Description:
The structure is cut from a larger assembly and holds chains A and B.
Chain A: H1 3-8, E1 27-32, E2 36-38, E3 48-55, E4 60-64, E5 77-81, E6 93-96
Parallel strand pairs in A: 4-6
Antiparallel strand pairs in A: 1-3, 1-5, 2-3, 3-4, 5-6
Chain B: H1 3-22, H2 24-53
The complex binds magnesium ion (122 copies).
The structure holds 2 RNA strands.
Amino acid sequence: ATLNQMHRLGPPKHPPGKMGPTAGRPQLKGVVLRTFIRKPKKPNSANRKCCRVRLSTGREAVCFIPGEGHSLQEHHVVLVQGGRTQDLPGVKLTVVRGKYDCGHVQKKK
Amino acid sequence: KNILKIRRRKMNHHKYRKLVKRTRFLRRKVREGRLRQKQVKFERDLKRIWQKAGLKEAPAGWQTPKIYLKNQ
RNA sequence: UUUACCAAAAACAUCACCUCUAGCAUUACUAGUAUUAGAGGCAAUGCCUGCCCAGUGACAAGUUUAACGGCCGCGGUACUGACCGUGCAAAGGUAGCAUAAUCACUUGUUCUCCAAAUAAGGACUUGUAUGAAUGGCCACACGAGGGUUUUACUGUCUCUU
RNA sequence: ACAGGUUUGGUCCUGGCCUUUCUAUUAAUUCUUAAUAAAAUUACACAUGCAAGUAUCCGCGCCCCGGUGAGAAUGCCCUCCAGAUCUUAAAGAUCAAAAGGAGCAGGUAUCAAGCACACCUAUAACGGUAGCUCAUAACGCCUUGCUCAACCACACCCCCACGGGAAACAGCAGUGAUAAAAAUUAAGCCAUGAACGAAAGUUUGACUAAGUUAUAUUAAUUAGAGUUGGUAAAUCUCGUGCCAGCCACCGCGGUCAUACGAUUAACCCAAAUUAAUAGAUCCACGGCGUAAAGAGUGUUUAAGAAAAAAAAUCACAAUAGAGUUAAAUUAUAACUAAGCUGUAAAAAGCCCUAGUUAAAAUAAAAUAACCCACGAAAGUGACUCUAAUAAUCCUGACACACGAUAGCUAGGACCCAAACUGGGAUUAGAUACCCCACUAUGCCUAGCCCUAAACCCAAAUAGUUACAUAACAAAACUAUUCGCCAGAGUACUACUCGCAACUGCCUAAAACUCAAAGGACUUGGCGGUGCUUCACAUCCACCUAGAGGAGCCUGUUCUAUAAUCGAUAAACCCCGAUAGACCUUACCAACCCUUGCCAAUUCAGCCUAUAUACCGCCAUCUUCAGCAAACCCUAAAAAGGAACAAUAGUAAGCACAAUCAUAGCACAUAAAAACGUUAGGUCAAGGUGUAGCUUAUGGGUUGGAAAGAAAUGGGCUACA
Lengths: 109, 72
Ligand SMILES: [Mg+2]
Ligand SMILES: [Mg+2]
Ligand SMILES: [Mg+2]
Ligand SMILES: [Mg+2]
Ligand SMILES: [Mg+2]
Ligand SMILES: [Mg+2]
Ligand SMILES: [Mg+2]
Ligand SMILES: [Mg+2]
Ligand SMILES: [Mg+2]
Ligand SMILES: [Mg+2]
Ligand SMILES: [Mg+2]
Ligand SMILES: [Mg+2]
Ligand SMILES: [Mg+2]
Ligand SMILES: [Mg+2]
Ligand SMILES: [Mg+2]
Ligand SMILES: [Mg+2]
Ligand SMILES: [Mg+2]
Ligand SMILES: [Mg+2]
Ligand SMILES: [Mg+2]
Ligand SMILES: [Mg+2]
Ligand SMILES: [Mg+2]
Ligand SMILES: [Mg+2]
Ligand SMILES: [Mg+2]
Ligand SMILES: [Mg+2]
Ligand SMILES: [Mg+2]
Ligand SMILES: [Mg+2]
Ligand SMILES: [Mg+2]
Ligand SMILES: [Mg+2]
Ligand SMILES: [Mg+2]
Ligand SMILES: [Mg+2]
Ligand SMILES: [Mg+2]
Ligand SMILES: [Mg+2]
Ligand SMILES: [Mg+2]
Ligand SMILES: [Mg+2]
Ligand SMILES: [Mg+2]
Ligand SMILES: [Mg+2]
Ligand SMILES: [Mg+2]
Ligand SMILES: [Mg+2]
Ligand SMILES: [Mg+2]
Ligand SMILES: [Mg+2]
Ligand SMILES: [Mg+2]
Ligand SMILES: [Mg+2]
Ligand SMILES: [Mg+2]
Ligand SMILES: [Mg+2]
Ligand SMILES: [Mg+2]
Ligand SMILES: [Mg+2]
Ligand SMILES: [Mg+2]
Ligand SMILES: [Mg+2]
Ligand SMILES: [Mg+2]
Ligand SMILES: [Mg+2]
Ligand SMILES: [Mg+2]
Ligand SMILES: [Mg+2]
Ligand SMILES: [Mg+2]
Ligand SMILES: [Mg+2]
Ligand SMILES: [Mg+2]
Ligand SMILES: [Mg+2]
Ligand SMILES: [Mg+2]
Ligand SMILES: [Mg+2]
Ligand SMILES: [Mg+2]
Ligand SMILES: [Mg+2]
Ligand SMILES: [Mg+2]
Ligand SMILES: [Mg+2]
Ligand SMILES: [Mg+2]
Ligand SMILES: [Mg+2]
Ligand SMILES: [Mg+2]
Ligand SMILES: [Mg+2]
Ligand SMILES: [Mg+2]
Ligand SMILES: [Mg+2]
Ligand SMILES: [Mg+2]
Ligand SMILES: [Mg+2]
Ligand SMILES: [Mg+2]
Ligand SMILES: [Mg+2]
Ligand SMILES: [Mg+2]
Ligand SMILES: [Mg+2]
Ligand SMILES: [Mg+2]
Ligand SMILES: [Mg+2]
Ligand SMILES: [Mg+2]
Ligand SMILES: [Mg+2]
Ligand SMILES: [Mg+2]
Ligand SMILES: [Mg+2]
Ligand SMILES: [Mg+2]
Ligand SMILES: [Mg+2]
Ligand SMILES: [Mg+2]
Ligand SMILES: [Mg+2]
Ligand SMILES: [Mg+2]
Ligand SMILES: [Mg+2]
Ligand SMILES: [Mg+2]
Ligand SMILES: [Mg+2]
Ligand SMILES: [Mg+2]
Ligand SMILES: [Mg+2]
Ligand SMILES: [Mg+2]
Ligand SMILES: [Mg+2]
Ligand SMILES: [Mg+2]
Ligand SMILES: [Mg+2]
Ligand SMILES: [Mg+2]
Ligand SMILES: [Mg+2]
Ligand SMILES: [Mg+2]
Ligand SMILES: [Mg+2]
Ligand SMILES: [Mg+2]
Ligand SMILES: [Mg+2]
Ligand SMILES: [Mg+2]
Ligand SMILES: [Mg+2]
Ligand SMILES: [Mg+2]
Ligand SMILES: [Mg+2]
Ligand SMILES: [Mg+2]
Ligand SMILES: [Mg+2]
Ligand SMILES: [Mg+2]
Ligand SMILES: [Mg+2]
Ligand SMILES: [Mg+2]
Ligand SMILES: [Mg+2]
Ligand SMILES: [Mg+2]
Ligand SMILES: [Mg+2]
Ligand SMILES: [Mg+2]
Ligand SMILES: [Mg+2]
Ligand SMILES: [Mg+2]
Ligand SMILES: [Mg+2]
Ligand SMILES: [Mg+2]
Ligand SMILES: [Mg+2]
Ligand SMILES: [Mg+2]
Ligand SMILES: [Mg+2]
Ligand SMILES: [Mg+2]
Ligand SMILES: [Mg+2]
């Protein structure tokens, strides 16, 4: 704008970050509620294996299971991370595989 | 063209008016309830002034008028 | 204000709002004259007061519901039915509100209150028998009205002296 | 940033999102050693040990080092220094509490007013004024250590600890609970610093030296991880078949996947490699007609800016009064007629109707106007008069006064118009378009409401036509300003504040979702748009003979059968068939035969799946005039490229045309008919790509089919 105007409002500052689903934490603990399946957005189609967890922050959320095949039951603990699924609406949480009651997707050799 | 921005507004306005009719009296209840919180918080704002200024009672000649609940 | 002597109220009245009737002179109304005066209605304020003149009145064949009064079915459809068929009506019950001082079912369902509530308050609600001046809905102040909670208090009571 | 990917059939423009760089934690996969550094979830609770002693008494010391970041917008910077303490022949000096301000200092104005927050008296605690702060951010609310040879703050909680809960590791180790977060209940005062000491010296979980850890660098002893569609370094064969899965962005998988799982080759990091979360970095000295952005108008306060010119007139329709009425309409009378009104066409409606002749009230103001005045904007154009258009003239708010229509309140008005509602049609329905009524409502007086596409989407005031074309449109710019704009929705929304509003106005978010949303443009295609010219068996008008009814022939479609396939809108339906009793024959029912036609072949044979893998043949637009290489132009080029008193186009090729055939001409018919379109038709003419079958999906014999309850297309023969 004009100078006086740029003086009245000062310099531009860059806005502090909006935290993700994990709320600033790189991973989180979780306890499963019900395993189920959800349908992808339009141009492509499948059915993905998905889960519901409670977190140490007390909040319940939808998280996703990467890989094919798994052993997941209620009350099983998992480590979750901030990977966002492109396929599904609003599923921003992903179970890290290889820790706790989720072992690596089993080799077929 | 630009109509397509404007058309949105039109629908988005119309769909509002409809709501405001159906939700109308519900909205009156909530509104008048909200003035009923208003006038009260006004009151506390003044009572806090006596009780900070040390006087127990309100100053002489104070009825503390209702502005927010004013009608007619 | 009311049943003098079993009812003081949620009845009546009432500011307000509304209809109808009246163009005028020595006893009422009135020594007035339509912003007036009579016959009523409903109850201030605030938001409102939907559709119906076929019936019965009323007025002047025609007109009137802030006059008496009314304000629907029976099937088919994505558990529900926006949609469709068809009939009947003068119109087909809206806005609200809702288990109510509202036939029954009925101690409706649920939430709060309590150790426990057929109580009380909040919701939900087809009430097929709510509902708009035979007024509907909120709201202030008010009430020897009618219910429920808490404080405090006690010979009400344990349980009497 | 030297930038890159990502909106569209495509091109620019605007514009977010993402990648490529560097750092820190944790995790998943791996990890040989040593060296240097750094070690940290948790102002949650703390088992056990230790962290203050020294010294002839007294005394000196005992959050000093050390810990932590809980709290507080705290504070950095800069004056000014009390007091503690050191030195000493009394002033030097080290910290520096408190008190202060040139200046700077987290977000939020949807926190806009705080509520005694000031001063005068030197009189000596009484009186006297009415102030102080604040849109240059007062008063709040939220979150936070730090500007780093250090600084600030806390020490179990009640900011402060007299008292109260209650029984304190935010000293070093270690331990529960919790968290994505995991060092030794280790050794000495030997070096330094500190505490005492006259002094040897004593103590010190400060510290020194170790010990534990891939957490970061160095170095070798040590090789494992990620990737290979694009951006972005690098791929082969299987498997799977919109499934299982994958991706940071675009996206990949629907039977041939370089994107998935697994190989193979490779690429790039390397004792590490990837993933996740935070940082560092990242807007606008850019912009505001059409893209997000100039508020509906004017004035002023604050606060700014400035050479000289900067008051001339209506070509006449500011505003507010008071009076007036020209054409029309209508009350309501008098003649006349039975009809009048209304649409594409009709009904309804009115016949207290229509025509003509008379006539006030209310309303509204032909022509002049092809004008371009007035007003700040909204606005203002029938007539006359009264009042009257701020400013020696830059800008200026949330303050002040205005503001079309519609709307609200009260009192009048009502010729006409008219939401609404009620009839009538139109229609599957018509809550509408079309007709008939008729109301609020437009009109006057007072008071509100304060919104418009209030738009000329172009801010005000000086200037200039110099530089210059994103695109379009109203050509391009400086200078001083004021207002405004940080992806798209969510949103003229939710909460807030204020307002004669209480379905209102104003001001105005976020969770969530997406990878776009948008401005202009280009070529098509289409248009129940307008205009011109046509259709020649061709749409209407017109001519002739038929079909749909009947019988029968034949083809489909359903049902029927153990019992083919294919075509199936125009462009299937006497269709591949110019031809099924066996055969043809693909089919079903049984039976039989396994180098099973050939010169040879771990080889033959397959009317098995794919016509959306194709060649061949064709249909169709189409009896349509174009289609395409080679060039050349266009203040950019997606693309377009003609005018004959011609303006940027030239072009061989191939269609059409021309010639051939119909036994001479001419005509007509025949043929011809490019490019592409319909993934149009056919793997059953045949041939093949890919997949399958191989004592069978192959090859033979024998017998069996094709029945009609219907439904229909086409024909033939008729009804004389
Ligand atoms: Mg991911
Ligand atoms: Mg919308
Ligand atoms: Mg509210
Ligand atoms: Mg009595
Ligand atoms: Mg009495
Ligand atoms: Mg009594
Ligand atoms: Mg009432
Ligand atoms: Mg009563
Ligand atoms: Mg009647
Ligand atoms: Mg109802
Ligand atoms: Mg209710
Ligand atoms: Mg009952
Ligand atoms: Mg009833
Ligand atoms: Mg009524
Ligand atoms: Mg009644
Ligand atoms: Mg009664
Ligand atoms: Mg009743
Ligand atoms: Mg009262
Ligand atoms: Mg009472
Ligand atoms: Mg009483
Ligand atoms: Mg009383
Ligand atoms: Mg777009
Ligand atoms: Mg595209
Ligand atoms: Mg387009
Ligand atoms: Mg993206
Ligand atoms: Mg680790
Ligand atoms: Mg660590
Ligand atoms: Mg502690
Ligand atoms: Mg410290
Ligand atoms: Mg520190
Ligand atoms: Mg502040
Ligand atoms: Mg100081
Ligand atoms: Mg807010
Ligand atoms: Mg605070
Ligand atoms: Mg903090
Ligand atoms: Mg304390
Ligand atoms: Mg104490
Ligand atoms: Mg410790
Ligand atoms: Mg301590
Ligand atoms: Mg532990
Ligand atoms: Mg020790
Ligand atoms: Mg060490
Ligand atoms: Mg390492
Ligand atoms: Mg290293
Ligand atoms: Mg090794
Ligand atoms: Mg490459
Ligand atoms: Mg499937
Ligand atoms: Mg394959
Ligand atoms: Mg990739
Ligand atoms: Mg792969
Ligand atoms: Mg920049
Ligand atoms: Mg521009
Ligand atoms: Mg925005
Ligand atoms: Mg403007
Ligand atoms: Mg303004
Ligand atoms: Mg506006
Ligand atoms: Mg100047
Ligand atoms: Mg006037
Ligand atoms: Mg007339
Ligand atoms: Mg006509
Ligand atoms: Mg008629
Ligand atoms: Mg004109
Ligand atoms: Mg004009
Ligand atoms: Mg004058
Ligand atoms: Mg002037
Ligand atoms: Mg001016
Ligand atoms: Mg000015
Ligand atoms: Mg106005
Ligand atoms: Mg009006
Ligand atoms: Mg009125
Ligand atoms: Mg009227
Ligand atoms: Mg009249
Ligand atoms: Mg009329
Ligand atoms: Mg109608
Ligand atoms: Mg139709
Ligand atoms: Mg039409
Ligand atoms: Mg009328
Ligand atoms: Mg007007
Ligand atoms: Mg305008
Ligand atoms: Mg305009
Ligand atoms: Mg204008
Ligand atoms: Mg505007
Ligand atoms: Mg705009
Ligand atoms: Mg301006
Ligand atoms: Mg210039
Ligand atoms: Mg161009
Ligand atoms: Mg947004
Ligand atoms: Mg608006
Ligand atoms: Mg609003
Ligand atoms: Mg405001
Ligand atoms: Mg024909
Ligand atoms: Mg034709
Ligand atoms: Mg026939
Ligand atoms: Mg026939
Ligand atoms: Mg069959
Ligand atoms: Mg067949
Ligand atoms: Mg077929
Ligand atoms: Mg076809
Ligand atoms: Mg075909
Ligand atoms: Mg034929
Ligand atoms: Mg045969
Ligand atoms: Mg065969
Ligand atoms: Mg097929
Ligand atoms: Mg084909
Ligand atoms: Mg086919
Ligand atoms: Mg072909
Ligand atoms: Mg040509
Ligand atoms: Mg060419
Ligand atoms: Mg070209
Ligand atoms: Mg010839
Ligand atoms: Mg010829
Ligand atoms: Mg031909
Ligand atoms: Mg030819
Ligand atoms: Mg041709
Ligand atoms: Mg096909
Ligand atoms: Mg073949
Ligand atoms: Mg083959
Ligand atoms: Mg065979
Ligand atoms: Mg046979
Ligand atoms: Mg037939
Ligand atoms: Mg014949
Ligand atoms: Mg014949």
